[model samples]
Structure formats: structure tokens, C-alpha cells
Target: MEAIPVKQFVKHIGELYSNNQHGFSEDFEEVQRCTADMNITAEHSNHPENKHKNRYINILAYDHSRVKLRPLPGSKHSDYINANYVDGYNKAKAYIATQGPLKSTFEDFWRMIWEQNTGIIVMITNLVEKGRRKCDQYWPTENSEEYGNIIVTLKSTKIHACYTVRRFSIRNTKNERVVIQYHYTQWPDMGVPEYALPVLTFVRRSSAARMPETGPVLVHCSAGVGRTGTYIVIDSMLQQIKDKSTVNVLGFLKHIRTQRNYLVQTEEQYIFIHDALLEAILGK
Candidate 1:
């Protein structure tokens, strides 16, 4: 052996860890996955997590995960509706512009949203034309605002869906370039479980992006907040407590407000994020 140089040894170690470590390229733990990468729960699709937690709200007083899940307040009804209120109308006019929306299909519906100054998270149910993706796929786009910059694409299945966190950071130079990345994911599992690791993973990962630390992330769904807050709580606050034992949950909620209005609407859902944080940090 030519006595591997210190640099060579360090390089080999990096490669070895990269190949085996779950920290980066390892396959994530999953209970279910749709055709594309959209993940779903065994529970029936239309069943909202709020409804499930609400079923116990009187007694539990919070969601299993406890992160304050509120509706978008007011409503944006989709023009395409039937006799039933189950119409398909998009809410929240502000959306990161893409080349064009992705194709819609039974198997998979995927649309790429890339705005120069925004962080995007595809918050959707599993049933969306192209819903689930590992959190890592969507974060790093070009020209990310880092200050509460996000673009969300949520796919709702009847039972449960997923949260894809996307973020962008501006690179050095006067032109203001954007650096993109796919952070972590909040997906489905039995008992509608809310794990804190994914939440922590996301923060730690996004932090690595060296974002300007501008504002909060943009989280949304058909309505916004319920499913949106669910993911946010799990990834940011809970993870924070678990990793560092710091509990400035109010700060967490405040960050979102700085970016956009109409956040964490319902009372029950509002507290769910907190409970979920508890569960994430302290355990079930």
C-alpha cells in the first residue's frame, strides 16, 4: 500500500458514509406509497386527520401530534363541482410559477413549480394526480427567497397523504441567483402517526441550505393549515425540541404569520401542533 494520504483517507470515508448513511441517500422508512412517490395511509382517503382528531377533541383537546391545525378560513371553492360540495377549486391565489402545471392522470399527477424567489413545499393528499415525494425532492429550486419562501403541491387521498418541503436560497453575486433543494417529508403511517424525526431532519437540512433566514415557510393544502400545520409542526418545532430541547413554539407559529396570513385557523387544529410536538419530543 502506498500509504493512503490523509486527504485520500478522508475522501474514501466520505464516500463510504454517503453510500450507507440514512442521513443522505438512504431509503426512508415508509408504510405505503402510491404509483409515483406519493405516500398514503391505509385509512380511507377522504378521511381528514382533523375529523379523526376531532372525534376525540372533546377528550383529547388536541391532535395526536398537537400542532394547531386550522382551516384556511373562508373558502376557495373550485369551479368544477358536482351537486356535492366536493368540487375542485384551487385556493390561495399566490403560487410559484412553473413552466406549466404538470400532467394529471389516474396513476400520477406531477407539476413542477419553480419561482426565482420562493421556497416550495408540495402539501398534498396521496390521491392527487401526482402527490407524494420524499421531502428531499422539492426543496432546492433556483432563486429561493429563504425568507418564508415555499411552493406547495398537495395531493389529498381519502384517508391520508404527505408533506413535501421545498426551499430555495439565493447564491452569492449581485444578480441574486437561487439554490434549490428537496428537504424532508412528512408522510402517512398506521394510527395516523406523527413522527418528529422528519420534522427535525427538514430543519437541520434546510439550515444547511444557508438560507437568509428571512421568514417562515409557505405551507398549504386545498384549504391550508390542517394538513399544512401537521407537517410543519412535526418537522420544525417538534424536531427542534427533540434535538435541542428548546421550546419557542410561539416563535414557530409567529414565523408562519410573518410570511402569510390566515394560518392555523381552527381551535382544535391549532393545538394539535403543540400536542404533536410533545409527542415528537417526549414520545407517545
Candidate 2:
């Protein structure tokens, strides 16, 4: 698919943004239709033994691109995790988009991180939001905590205006690594942030912190589709714009959905991504 020129892309986003009444609805529907049905399967996520590992009953990970944990010797259901490998711009498996950790899957969550050698985690939801638990506290508040065979120590934390950056030192019997978690605190559940600047800045900081040789960045927000998907689109498109002076929002979204369902899950989130990308283009 040809990438849309930056000037044309900006105008397109402007039309959708200003036409509030009907433009966005039609575009969003087209994205949905374009991404529908390719006979993808989530057999591992659907197995009875793996049912309890999911934070939401309906958000299953596609087996083809899902992150598979290294199975323990003689363990039947030791390899399941609610996460998928998502491509970025021209990078394959640049990200592991996943649901927030659940109490039952904390061990598996850390195991995947260790096995994949992940260096960055972008969390876009609060642990508890509006009196409901959105994600389990998978890391330690102070010194350290052990998840399965992995031990994660909270090294330091820096608070920003709209996000918090935490550094963690994670280790097991084999080796240890440093992982950074950039937690964007202001985004609402199932909704877009009031403005795009904070989200863009958050993306910039997280992207800069990523090391080239580390594993795919792990990103999650509650169910992991809405906010997670929105962030990935904006981040990837920003790079696309920088590299090629163009963007292909729809094509990229279609690419990711084949790996995992429901990416950029809502119309509002989709619009927000366009807004955020436009902001990046104009502000630069």
C-alpha cells in the first residue's frame, strides 16, 4: 500500500476531526471492515486450561503471533500468556501488546519478559480505576518481589507531569536485566486523553529509552487493545512520517489486527491516534 503524503494525511485527519458528525464513523467502519476475518485462530488462548489466564473472557490472544512462554519440563499448560507480537514500521516483533497482568498470570507475565529479554514496558492504565481493578500490581512498591522464578526489584522512580517512569532490576538464577516501565497516568479507561501532547511526549520518552538489541517492548492497558493499540499506531506512524515523510494508518492497523484481534479497538481511540500523529507532524 502506498503511504499517504504528510500534507495529504494532515488534511485527511482534519476532515475527519472537523466533520465530527459522520466522517469519523465512516472511516472507522472502513477500518473495521478492512480488518475483518482472515480465519485467524487463538487455539491456545481458548483451551480450557488457559481460560483462567485471561483478564477478560473475550480478549483472547491469536496463537500464531502470541508470545509463548518456555514450557516447564512435563508441564501441560505452562506456555500461555495473554500477549501478541506486533510489528512496528519496518520492524518485526518490535512490540508485545498484552493485557494487564492478572493475579493468576503474574508469574507467566514475568516469565515472558525474562524469556523475551524485554527492556521496556509501556503501561497506560491505572491499577485501580473508578473503583474497579484494571490491572494487578505485578511489581513491587518498594524493594523487591518474586514472581515465579523471577525476582523484580524496584530500583528507582521518577514522576512526570502526566506519567511516571520506573526502573526495575529483574533477575533469576540464570541472569539479570534492567527494564523500564513508563506508566502514563492520565489516560481514561476506554477513552482518549483530553489532548494529544501528553501521549506524544510519553511515546517519545519511551521510544528513546528503548535499546536496539533488547526484546520487543511490552505494552499493556487493562484489556490491552484500546489504549495499547492506540499508542502503537501513533508511535509507529510517527516513525513512518520521520523515515518516509508519509503515513499509512489504515494499512498498519490492518497489519497488526492479523497478529492480534481488536487493535485500535474503538472509534474514539482510532481518531485519537490520527490526532496524535497530526500533532507530531505539525509540532515538528
Candidate 3:
């Protein structure tokens, strides 16, 4: 649980990979053990009225840390959403990690965004992967569209080889706000990228674009665990290194699971965090 100096952490990753511990399976198993018995509850997510709102039946948000929407008039379960408030670096509630929007949950998703005054969204999955729908198109593709009470218009989009950035104008009867979305297109479902540089680059750009007064950055990918957790870990650790010059990969991941279960969902994805941090520290 000790914080490893950045230089030593780089050396540790090199030694592990060279010795056939490239995937860090044992380390990931330890993380699994550390979080196995927290006794957290997701009762709200399992409620009869809320059950159908989740994207994946098994991946539910913990009750204590779940994001609660402002209850709408005449709607009994309007306050529920499958999202959690995850800490980043030294900041609490720095990000809202949630599942990819389901067709049934689109309106609720936008409602959460509006109520929270969110300024950014980090989408790490494509709309469809291998012909299976991974996420609903929650934002407008052309001019504008409305999700419940919020109207979303695509202001601009910039495409890159590994990612795409879009600016949106989201509004309601009372006010309007600008929200930017950074969509990474290279990551595969349940898998890590072949190299960590692109992901690191994407993370850097997205983190830099954030404005502190604009609420928590919303992040999601499919079930909202694997890729979402991995991104939060890397981004948080990068900030940690900036402020403290050290990192605690295992300890931080353990702390992250308490707020939401099954983060850094795969052994390979866990190892990729180390690789990405190493690449960032070395200025590669």
C-alpha cells in the first residue's frame, strides 16, 4: 500500500513484464480479494421500478455512492440512475462513472446530465461493436434532438485517427450549457489497446479540456466498469503523480472499488494502467 516513486514504479513494471508477468494477473487477483467483502448494497438499482433502467443486469451501482437525479413530478422512481460518484486524485466527486445509455434510459441519462450541470462526457465505446449495440446514441448526430426536457445540438465535431471530439449545446426551458465529449474509438470491448500511447494521449487531451466549475466529468463505456474504471485510474494517477510525484496503483484501485464495484474489470486492463502510466511518466 506504499506509494511507489514514479521512477521505481517504471522499473517495477519493466521487471514484471520481463518475467512473464505482463498481464499482472496475481496483482489483479489481490485487488479482487481486497474488494470481495465490502458488503455494499445496490437495492435501489434492483427495485422493481428501477431494474429495467440498467444497461447490464449484473452491473449495478452501489447505493451509498450512486448518483441521484432530481425527482420529477408524478414519477415515483425519478431519482434513480445507474451511475456513481468516483473520486479523482485528491478531489472528491470528480467524475460520474455510469453505464452506456440504454434505449430505455436515454431520458434519465440526459436528465442526470442537466441536473448535475456536467460540462464533459468521455465515451470510450462505439455505438455498435461486432454488430452488438454497446451504447445508445444519446446525443444529436446532426442538428438537434430532445431527450426528455433537454434539447441537445451538435455544435461541432473534430475527428482523429484514434478518437473524435464533439462539442454540444444542451438546453432546457430554464438555461443552456456547453458540453464536450471525447470519444475514444480504438479500444475493443473487454480488451486493452495493443499499445498504451494512444490511450494516454486521449486521456491527456480530455483531462486538459476539463473546466473545474462544470461539475464532474461523466465517463461511460458499455457496462461502465472495465474501460471506464481503467480510464479513471490512469487519469487520477496521472494527477496524483503531478501533485505528489508518486503513485499507489493497488491502493488507489482498492479505494475506487469501494465507491463502485468491478472497476478495472479485467486483468489485462489492470495491467494496461501500469503500462499507460509508465508511458506517461517516461514522456513517451
User: Which candidate achieves the best lDDT against the true structure?
Assistant: 3
Worst 10 residues of 3 by lDDT: 16-25
Q: Which candidate would rank higher by TM-score, 1 or 2?
A: 2
For all candidates in order, the CA lDDT equals 0.31, 0.89, 0.89
Error of 3 at 124 (Å): 0.4
TM match of model 1 to true structure: 0.33
Tell me the deviation in Å of residue 204 in model 2: 0.7
- Give a tens-digit lDDT track for model 2, residues 6-80: 999988887876756377788778778774567788888889999999999899899899999987877687989
**Cα RMSD of predicted structure 2:** 1.4
Per-model TM-score on C-alpha atoms: 0.33, 0.96, 0.96
TM-score of model 3 relative to the true fold?
Answer: 0.96
Which whole-number lDDT from 0 to 100 does residue 219 have in model 3? 96
What does the lDDT come to for candidate 1?
A: 0.31
Residue-level lDDT of model 1, residues 123-197, one tens digit each, is 433333245321222222333222222323232222212234333333332123343333233444222335444
Clash total of candidate 2: 0
